Design a protein around this ligand. Structure first.
Ligand SMILES: CCCCCCCCCCCCO[C@@H]1O[C@H](CO)[C@@H](O[C@H]2O[C@H](CO)[C@H](O)[C@H](O)[C@H]2O)[C@@H](O)[C@H]1O
Lengths: 1044, 107, 268, 54, 54
C-alpha cells in the first residue's frame, strides 16, 4: 500500500522475486499450439489378412463391439471395417477423461473378446492404443545413389527405427510407409502341381522343419552323486537365410530326385507387405508416420523423438541420411516466437509514447519497467494454475499490456500532475496521488473480474479457450495492481525528479516543449468543448442512440467463426482413383502431381512425399496421399506463394482436368478436431435393414438435400460405394465325394491368394515373419482360379474348375458402424454465412422421412454444437448486473453506476467497424479483443465520474464545475495510455507470416475498438454522468460542503 | 527409508528346456517388439537365461505412478501372448512391480 | 556406488554375439590399461559356456517312419521335462511333470538309450539320425532397449571423480568397430544428468538469500557483510571431515547446510 | 546392518556338486572362526546374483 | 442416469413392434424426487415459522 514507498529496496526485491518467479516458471511451463482440446479416444485396430469387408465386420468387429460393454464415460463407438481386413474401432469420450483409465478399461474389456477371435487375427496382433489423429510429424528416409529399393530402406526403418521410436513417452501409433523384411515364399502353381503338392504340405513343411526346440541339458537337473558336467543341449534351430529355405524338403522321390521348396516356389527375403509404397520426390523412400499422444505436449514429444533418432544417426548405412517432409512443430515455434517478438516490440513503442509525454528519461523508465515484471509474474500464476504457454494465454499477455500500461501510467501520471499543481516534493505527492487512485485501482480491478470472469463460464473446446483467456487477463491484471501498490509508487517517489508548482512543460528549451504548448493549449480546447456539450444534453442522447444501434446492425450481419486457417508452411494433397484400381495407376497419378509441384511451384515447394496405398479412413490400391514440404519463408514473397493460392490453383490444375479426384490442401491450425460450418451426420439402421436398404436410404438423403441450394453445400457422403465382388460359392457336394478335403481346399485357396504367416525367422539377428502366398501372375485375371489343384486323399489333384462356381456382385469395402450398430456417415456444410444450427435442423427434418429402422444421430463435430451453445446472452447479463452492482458499491448510488455502463457501446462499434473494414470475423479473438476494449473504456470513464463525484462531495464544487475539472485533470493520461497502446498494437495488424492471421485478428479489433472508445467517451462520459446523476438528487441540487 | 528408487516393472517367463537363444527368440524379441507405446519410458533390459526364464525389466522416469506403468506394461504384453510358444503361454508370464527391499526373510 | 559406473555396450547393426563379445574384450583390455582413470573394469554377465549340439541329420530319419515332432518332443520330454496336466491333491491344485529319470539322461552317451518308435512299428536309435558337436554359447542373453547388448560394470581410480572416468570411457569406447554404440543405465543414468546441476541450485539459494537480507535491512551492501560469514562455518566442518577421515556424504552435506544456517543466524 | 552376505562363483559350466562343496565350506567357516559373531548361515545353491546356474 | 436412460429408450421407440412395450416395475428414482420435495417443503416451512416467531 504505502509501507513500501518508504522502503524502495523492499519493493525492488518484490519486483525481482516476482521476476525470477517469472523466468523460473518460464523455463518449465507447457507450450503447445493450443491447449489440449481433443476429447479423449481409444482406438483398437485388428488385422485379418485376406478378409473381405463383411468378414472384418463379422469375425472381429462385432465380436468385440459386444464386449465393449461397461466402459466409463462412454460418449460413442465407431467401427471402420475395411476391405483390407483391418478394422478400426474408435471410442470417443467425455472431455479430459484421463486416458489411462479409459484405455485400461477398454483393453480389459477386449480381453473377453480375445478368445472368441481367429488365430489369424490373434496372431497378426490386435492393438489397443491411446492416440490423436493428425500426424505429429512424418520422418522420411532415403538414399543418394539409391543403391537400395523401397523394400531395403523400409526394412532398415522397421529393423533399426520403428521398434523403438514408438517407445518414447508420448507417441501413439507410428505408421510405417513401406514394410519390414519377411521371409517371402511365392508358390509356383504349375511346378507345384507337378511334383504332387498342395500349399498345405508347404505349410506343415516349413513349420515343423524350421523351428527352435525345447531341448534340455547335459547333466540335467537333478543330476546324480558325483556328476561333473553341466552343459546345454542345442537341438534343432530356427533359420537364417534363403538357402536354408530353398533346402527345405517336402517329400523324397523314389529314385533320388527330391522335391525341394527351392524348386517348387521362389524364395526371397521380401517385405511382409507389398501394399503401400512411398515415394519422396519420385525418389524411393520409406517414412515414419508419427501420431501425437493422448494429451502430451507436442514440442516435448517431438523433442524426445528427435533425441532417439538423433541417436540412431551414427549407425545408418551408406548415404542413408534422414529427410524431413512434415512437422507441425516449427509452426508452433515460429508462431509463439512472433507473438513474443511483438511483446518486446509493444513495450518498445510504449516507452516511446511515454517519453513523448513525460519528457524525463529516468521517469519514463518507471512504467517501462512496470510491465516486464507483471508479465513474468503471470507465467508463474500459470505454472501455479495448471496452464500453458499457449496462443490463448500469450495473446492474453500481449493483450493485457493495455491494462498494465494504463495502471502504471495513471499512477505516475497522477503524481506528476499533483507535482505540477501545488509544488510538493515527489514523495508526499506520491503519497497523495496514491491517497486518491488507490481505491479506484482496486475497484476497477473488481469490476474487471466481473466482466472477464463470466467469459470463463463457457462450455466446450471453445470453453477451454475463453477460460484460458479470462484467466491470463484477470490474473495478469491483479499482478499489475499489486505492482501499482508496491513497486510503482515507490518508484514515483524515488527516481522521479520534482517539478515545482505549475511548470507544465511550456517549450522552455525548444524541442520536446513546443509540444507541451501544443498539448496544454489543446486540453483547454477539449475542456471548453465538453463544457460546450454539457450545455445541450438531448442532442447527444440521440447521437448515442445512433451509436448503439449502429453497433447493433454492424454486429448482426457479421459472420461468426471459429479460428484462423494459417499457412503453417507445410501442406498435403489427397488422391483417389475409381472403383477397383491398381497400384500402377495410382503411382501414375502420384507421379503426375509430383511433376506439377516441382514446376509451377518450383520456387515455393521443396519436397513432395507421395504416399501410395494409404489414404485417410484407411488403405487400398485406389488411394494415395502426398505430404508436401515447402521452401523457407524468406524466398516466398507475395500472397500467391501461400497455401490458399497454391492449393486453390493446384486443385484447379487437378480437378477440372482429371479422371480421378485429387485435391491439394492445408489442415487447419488445430491438430485434429472439428471445424466451423459443417458437421458429421450418422445415419443408422436400427431394426436390421441390411447394407442395401441403408446405403439406399443414404441415396434418398443425398438427393433430399440436393433439393435445397438455399442451405446445404457439397452434397456428399464420405465413404466408398460398393465395389465389384467375385463369389466362389463352392458346391461342397461335388468335392465331398471326390476324395478332396474341405479344410485343405480352404487353406490352399487362402495361402494362395490371401497368404499365410507360418513361422518366424532370424534376419541378421532380428526376428521377422515367414509368409507364403502365390506368385504374382497366377492371381490377377479371374481365369487363374483354374491353375490350382487339391491333392486329394487318394493322390489325384482336383481342378478348381471342379468344385467351385463363379459370379459378380456388389458390396462395400468399408463397413462403417456407429454406436454398436451398422451405420453410414454423411458429411456436409451449411450455406456460407449461414449457421450450422439451421442446417442441422433441416437435416433432422429431411432424414426424418426414411424407412422404419433407419434413424438419425450426430457425432464428433455435430456433438460440439447440440448439448451447449447460445450461453452468451446470459453470460453477459451476468457480467452486466454483477458489474452494475459493483458500481453501486463503488459509487454507493444506484443512479450513478449507470453512467459508467453507458460507455459500453463506444468501444464496440469501433471494433466491429474495424472488422468489417478489414474483412475479419466475429471469431473468438474478436470477442477477446472486444473484452479487453470494453474494459479499458470502463477504466477511463470510471476514473472520470469518480473524480467528479469526489470534487462535488469532498470539495463542494458544483455538478458541471466538477465534471469539467474531472475531464480536465485526466484527458492527458487517457490519451497517453490509449495512444501508447494503439502504437504497441500496430505490429499485430501489420504482422505478416506465422499465424499473422491471429495477430491481424487481435490487432484489428483492438485498434478500431480503442479509437472509437477513447475518442468518443472522452466526450460522452460527462454527458453520461450529468444526465444520469440528474435522475438522482439529495445534497447535489448543486452541491457545496465542508471538511473533516 | 522413503520411497526412493525409480519405479520399474519386471516381466518373467519360463520356457522349460530353452537354451539362451531360444528364450531370446521365441519370447524375448516378441515381447521387446510389442512394448511399443506405454507412457514415461526411461529404458528396457532383457535376460534370456539358460534356465529358460526370461526376465524383462522396464525402468521408468521418476515419480511415474507405478500402478499405471505396471498396467500399460501388463496390457501391452497381454497382446503378444498369443504370439508366444505354448510351454511359455501355459506356464505363466509374470508382470510384477520390482525392487529388492524384502522387509524380512523367514526360513 | 560413488566412484564409477554401469556401461552398456550395444550392438546396433545386424551383428552377432561373437562380434559383440570381441568388441567387449577389445574395450575391456584397452581400458584395463588406464589406472590413470579406471580401476576394475569388469563385465557383469555370463561368459560363453561349452554347449552340445545335436544337429539331427534330418535325411537319415525322413523315411524311417519317424516324425520330427515326435523326435523333438521325445528328446525334449526326455532331457528337459514337460508340464502336462494338473491335479488336485489334499485340496490344492499342482503341476504334473513328466521327465526322464536321473541317470538315463545325464552324460552324452545316454543319448543312445532312447529310441523313436516309427510309424510302422520299428524303433530307431538316436545315434541313427542325430549327430553331436561341441561349440560355445552364452547362457545369459542380455538386451538393452530392444537390441542385443552387453553390460560392463566398472569404476574410476580411488580418488578420481566418476565423471572423468565416464568421459574417458566415451573417448575409449569411441575406438570400437561399426555396429557398436555406447549407452548408460540405472545408477550411471540417474546420476549422469544430475551432477553439474548443483551450481544452479546454489544460484537460486545464495541469490535469494542475498535478496532477503537486502529486504530485511534495506541495503544491497549490508547483506554482503552478513553473507561473508559463510566460509567461517565451513572450514570447520571440512577440517573435521578430513581429520575424522570421513567423507563428503549427504548427511555431511545437509549438515554443512545447517551450519551455514547458524552462521547466518548469528551474523544476521 | 547386522547381517551380511558372500557371493560364490564356480568356473564355467561347473556342477551343483562343487557349488554345494564351497557353500558348506563357508557355512562351516562362519560357525568356526566366527563361532562367536555368527548366529545363522543361509546357503543357496543354484541361485546367486550374477545370474542363474548350478 | 434415469434422464439419460429413459432418453435412450425414447430413442429406441421408433423400433418397437406392436405392443413391445416398456414397463416400469422397479424404479428408485421417484422416491428421490418426492423425498427431496418434502425436504424443501420442510425447509421453507422452517423459515416461515422462524419469521413468525420473530
Ligand atoms: C492532441 C489533441 C487533443 C484533442 C483535443 C480536441 C478538442 C477540440 C474540439 C473542438 C470542437 C468542439 O465541439 C463542441 O460541440 C458543441 C456542440 O454543442 C459546441 O458547443 C457550442 O455549440 C452549442 C450549440 O451550437 C451551444 O450553444 C454551446 O453554448 C456552445 O458552446 C462546440 O463549440 C464544442 O463544444
Amino acid at each position: 500500500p504505502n509501507f513500501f514507498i518508504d522502503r524502495p529496496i523492499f519493493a525492488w526485491v518484490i519486483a525481482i522475486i516476482i521476476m525470477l518467479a517469472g523466468g523460473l516458471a518460464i523455463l518449465k511451463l507447457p507450450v503447445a499450439q493450443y491447449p489440449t482440446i481433443a476429447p479423449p479416444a481409444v482406438t483398437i485396430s485388428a488385422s485379418y489378412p485376406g478378409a473381405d469387408a463383411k468378414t472384418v465386420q463379422d469375425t472381429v468387429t462385432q465380436v468385440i463391439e459386444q464386449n465393449m460393454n461397461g466402459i466409463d464415460n462412454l460418449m460413442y463407438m465407431s467401427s471402420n471395417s475395411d476391405s483390407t481386413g483391418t478394422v478400426q474401432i474408435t471410442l470417443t469420450f467425455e472431455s479430459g477423461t484421463d486416458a489411462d483409465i479409459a484405455q485400461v478399461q477398454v483393453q480389459n474389456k477386449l480381453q473377453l473378446a480375445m478368445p472368441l477371435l481367429p488365430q489369424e487375427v490373434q496372431q497378426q496382433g490386435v492393438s489397443v492404443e491411446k492416440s490423436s489423429s493428425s500426424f505429429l510429424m512424418v520422418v522420411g528416409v532415403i538414399n543418394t545413389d539409391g543403391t537400395m529399393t523401397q523394400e531395403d530402406i523400409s526394412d532398415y526403418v522397421a529393423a533399426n527405427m520403428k521398434d523403438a521410436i514408438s517407445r518414447t513417452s508420448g507417441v501413439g501409433d507410428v505408421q510405417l510407409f513401406g514394410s519390414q523384411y519377411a521371409m517371402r515364399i511365392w508358390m509356383n502353381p504349375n511346378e507345384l502341381n507337378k511334383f504332387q503338392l498342395t500349399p498345405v504340405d508347404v505349410i506343415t513343411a516349413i513349420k515343423a522343419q524350421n523351428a527352435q526346440v525345447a531341448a534340455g541339458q547335459l547333466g540335467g537337473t537333478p543330476p546324480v552323486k558325483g556328476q561333473q558336467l553341466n552343459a546345454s543341449i542345442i537341438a534343432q534351430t530356427r533359420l537364417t537365410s534363403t538357402e536354408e529355405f530353398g533346402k527345405i524338403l517336402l517329400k523324397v522321390n523314389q529314385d533320388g530326385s527330391r522335391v525341394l521348396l527351392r524348386d517348387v516356389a521362389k524364395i526371397e527375403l521380401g517385405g511382409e507387405n507389398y501394399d503401400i509404397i512411398a515415394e519422396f520426390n519420385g525418389q524411393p523412400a520409406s517414412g515414419l508416420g508419427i501420431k501425437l499422444a493422448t494429451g502430451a505436449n507436442a514440442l516435448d514429444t517431438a523433442a524426445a523423438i528427435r533425441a532417439e533418432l538423433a541417436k540412431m544417426e551414427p549407425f545408418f548405412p551408406s548415404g542413408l541420411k534422414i529427410v524431413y517432409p512434415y512437422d507441425t512443430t516449427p509452426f508452433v515455434k515460429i508462431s509463439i516466437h512472433e507473438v513474443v517478438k511483438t511483446l518486446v516490440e509493444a513495450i518498445i513503442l510504449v516507452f516511446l509514447v511515454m517519453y513523448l509525454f513525460l519528457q524525463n528519461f529516468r521517469a519514463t523508465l518507471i512504467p517501462t519497467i512496470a510491465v516486464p515484471v507483471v508479465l513474468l509474474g503471470t507465467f508463474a500464476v500459470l505454472a501455479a494454475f495448471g496452464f500453458s504457454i499457449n496462443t490463448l494465454t500469450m495473446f492474453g499477455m500481449v493483450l493485457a499490456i493495455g491494462l498494465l500500461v494504463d495502471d502504471a501510467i495513471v499512477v505516475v501520471e497522477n503524481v506528476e500532475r499533483v507535482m505540477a499543481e501545488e509544488g510538493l516534493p515527489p514523495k508526499e505527492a506520491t503519497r497523495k496521488s496514491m491517497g486518491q487512485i488507490q481505491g479506484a485501482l482496486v475497484g476497477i480491478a473488481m469490476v474487471l473480474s466481473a466482466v472477464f470472469v463470466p467469459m470463463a463460464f463457457f462450455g466446450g473446446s471453445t470453453g477451454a479457450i475463453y477460460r484460458q483467456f479470462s484467466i491470463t487477463i484477470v490474473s495478469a491484471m491483479a499482478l499489475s495492481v499489486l505492482v501499482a501498490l508496491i513497486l510503482t509508487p515507490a518508484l514515483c517517489a524515488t527516481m522521479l525528479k520534482p517539478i515545482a508548482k505549475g511548470d507544465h512543460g511550456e517549450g522552455k528549451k525548444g524541442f520536446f516543449g513546443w509540444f507541451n504548448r501544443m498539448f496544454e493549449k489543446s486540453t483547454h480546447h477539449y475542456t471548453d468543448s465538453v463544457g460546450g456539450i454539457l450545455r445541450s444534453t438531448g442532442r447527444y442522447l440521440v447521437l448515442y442512440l445512433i451509436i448503439v444501434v449502429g453497433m447493433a446492425y454492424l454486429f448482426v450481419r457479421l459472420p461468426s467463426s471459429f479460428l484462423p486457417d494459417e499457412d503453417q508452411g507445410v501442406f498435403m494433397t489427397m488422391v483417389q482413383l475409381p472403383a477397383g484400381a491398381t497400384q500402377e495407376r495410382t503411382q501414375k497419378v502420384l507421379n503426375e502431381v509430383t511433376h506439377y509441384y516441382l514446376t509451377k511451384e518450383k520456387n515455393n515447394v521443396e519436397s513432395v512425399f507421395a504416399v501410395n496405398g494409404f489414404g485417410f479412413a484407411g488403405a487400398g490400391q485406389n488411394t494415395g496421399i502426398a505430404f508436401v514440404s515447402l521452401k523457407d519463408w524468406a524466398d516466398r514473397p507475395g500472397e500467391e506463394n501461400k497455401v490458399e493460392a497454391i492449393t486453390m490453383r493446384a486443385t484447379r490444375a487437378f480437378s477440372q482436368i482429371k479422371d480421378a479426384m485429387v485435391f491439394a490442401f492445408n489442415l487447419p491450425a488445430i491438430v485434429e478436431l472439428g471445424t466451423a460450418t459443417g458437421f458429421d451426420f450418422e445415419l443408422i439402421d436400427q431394426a436390421g435393414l441390411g447394407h442395401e436398404k441403408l446405403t439406399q436410404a443414404r441415396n434418398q438423403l443425398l438427393a433430399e438435400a440436393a433439393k435445397h441450394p438455399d442451405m446445404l453445400t457439397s452434397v456428399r457422403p464420405n465413404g466408398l460405394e460398393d465395389t465389384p465382388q467375385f463369389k466362389i460359392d463352392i458346391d461342397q457336394e461335388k468335392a465331398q465325394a471326390l476324395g478332396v478335403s474341405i479344410n485343405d481346399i480352404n487353406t490352399t485357396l487362402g495361402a494362395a491368394w490371401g497368404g499365410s504367416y507360418v513361422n518366424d525367422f532370424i534376419d541378421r539377428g532380428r526376428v521377422k515373419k515367414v509368409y507364403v502366398m502365390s506368385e504374382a501372375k497366377y492371381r490377377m485375371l479371374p481365369d487363374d482360379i483354374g491353375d490350382w489343384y487339391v491333392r486329394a486323399a487318394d493322390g489325384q489333384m482336383v481342378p478348381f474348375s471342379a468344385f467351385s462356381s463363379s459370379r459378380w456382385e456388389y458390396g462395400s469395402p468399408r463397413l462403417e458402424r456407429y454406436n454398436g450398430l451398422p451405420s453410414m456417415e454423411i458429411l456436409g456444410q451449411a450455406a456460407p454465412g449461414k449457421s450450422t444450427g439451421e442446417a442441422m435442423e433441416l437435416m433432422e427434418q429431411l432424414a426424418s422421412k426414411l424407412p422404419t429402422g433407419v434413424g438419425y444421430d450426430w457425432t464428433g463435430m455435430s456433438y460440439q454444437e447440440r448439448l451447449s451453445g447460445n450461453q452468451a446472452p446470459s453470460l453477459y447479463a451476468i457480467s452486466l448486473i454483477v458489474v452494475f452492482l459493483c458500481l453501486a458499491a463503488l459509487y454507493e448510488s444506484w443512479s450513478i453506476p449507470f453512467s459508467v455502463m453507458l460507455v459500453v457501446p463506444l468501444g464496440v462499434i469501433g471494433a466491429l467497424l474495424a472488422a468489417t473494414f478489414r474483412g475479419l470475423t466475429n471469431d473468438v479473438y474478436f470477442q477477446v479483443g472486444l473484452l479487453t476494449t470494453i474494459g479499458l473504456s470502463a477504466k477511463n470513464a470510471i476514473l472520470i465520474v469518480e473524480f467528479a463525484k469526489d470534487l462535488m462531495d469532498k470539495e463542494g464544487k458544483g455538478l458541471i464545475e466538477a465534471t469539467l475539472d474531472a475531464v480536465r485533470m485526466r484527458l492527458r493520461p487517457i490519451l497517453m495510455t490509449s495512444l501508447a497502446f494503439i502504437l504497441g498494437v500496430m505490429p499485430l495488424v501489420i504482422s505478416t507470416g506465422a499465424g499473422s492471421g491471429a495477430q491481424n485478428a487481435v490487432g484489428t479489433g483492438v485498434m478500431g475498438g480503442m479509437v472509437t472508445a477513447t475518442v468518443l467517451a472522452i466526450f460522452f462520459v460527462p454527458v453520461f454522468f450529468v444526465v444520469v446523476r440528474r435522475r438522482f438528487s439529495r445534497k447535489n441540487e448543486d452541491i457545496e460542503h465542508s471538511h473533516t
